[PDB]
Design a protein around this ligand. Structure first.
Ligand SMILES: Cc1cc2nc3c(=O)[nH]c(=O)nc-3n(C[C@H](O)[C@H](O)[C@H](O)COP(=O)(O)OP(=O)(O)OC[C@H]3O[C@@H](n4cnc5c(N)ncnc54)[C@H](O)[C@@H]3O)c2cc1C
Ligand SMILES: Cc1cc2nc3c(=O)[nH]c(=O)nc-3n(C[C@H](O)[C@H](O)[C@H](O)COP(=O)(O)OP(=O)(O)OC[C@H]3O[C@@H](n4cnc5c(N)ncnc54)[C@H](O)[C@@H]3O)c2cc1C
Lengths: 119, 119
């Protein structure tokens, strides 16, 4: 073993925005980069849905594509315009991936994104 | 969330992540690392990070990175790495000590992005 608790610490400080959600997309965990990019804090992010990031201007068919891959237990990648807490907007390169149990069943989702702005 | 979920998170993160012993032998590499560097899941666990080195990168960069890690401090900068297929890529790399509860180094962590577009 690598000591197992090094993985959480690695997530926490990785320089990519990372959230982990239940099957509803309610946020169970978010790392520091997520907090820095999106603007939401440590206590306030928990239990909110990912949709909080949408500047309600993403076409429904982008999301349909994202959820369509998830329902097939496959990852998806795309770009979308997200909104920070301060209402500024950024082009997000988003990957979402299912976490599968031994049986091949989805038990969480991983949301992992970069903010592609150069300021 | 159990530690396995964070290991899965690291494994699927869209940034190269490697964890090494204190002489930079790779003990763990995620999918992005293996894809970017060209080393597969078995052979990469017999490599050292030095297999990425190459002469486009000034040697003082390697001295810089080590001089910070040995102080228990991170280093962030840029270097040119060599893949298994012998192509080269400009990487933006952060390395950090992984510390136990007494503040002593137990592993090193590397996280990098591949800035290439023509590979
Ligand atoms: C891990 C993860 C990360 C995500 N990151 C983002 C992000 O960074 N930015 C962002 O805008 N959104 C993100 N989402 C998608 C987000 O959860 C919402 O579905 C989305 O923002 C649209 O929500 P709405 O309330 O605006 O539209 P809604 O009308 O609620 O959803 C729009 C469409 O998405 C699909 N859909 C929504 N909910 C579900 C469901 N539970 N199951 C199957 N299909 C569904 C449907 O096609 C629906 O028409 C992420 C989801 C996951 C799981
Ligand atoms: C986590 C991590 C990630 C790294 N990522 C990269 C990367 O992406 N690209 C890259 O080219 N290099 C990377 N390095 C640096 C790498 O360890 C080498 O220093 C570098 O590749 C030059 O290799 P070299 O053959 O000239 O070996 P030298 O640096 O000459 O060192 C000789 C050998 O000893 C090891 N080493 C070097 N310094 C020390 C020391 N102070 N203590 C013990 N062992 C040491 C080296 O890795 C190598 O195996 C990373 C190092 C670490 C710890």
């Amino acid at each position: 073993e690598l000591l197992p608790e090094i993985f959480r610490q690695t997530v926490e400080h990785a320089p990519i925005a990372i959230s982990i959600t239940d099957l509803k997309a309610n946020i169970l965990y978010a790392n520091r980069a997520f907090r820095t990019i999106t603007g939401y804090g440590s206590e306030e992010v928990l239990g909110k849905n990912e949709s909080i990031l949408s500047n309600g201007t993403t076409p429904r068919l982008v999301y349909q594509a994202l959820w369509g891959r998830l329902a097939q237990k496959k990852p998806w990648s795309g770009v979308l315009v997200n909104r920070r807490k301060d209402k500024t907007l950024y082009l997000a390169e988003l990957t979402v991936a299912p976490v599968l149990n031994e049986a091949g069943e989805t038990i969480y989702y991983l949301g992992m994104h970069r903010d592609t702005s150069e300021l």
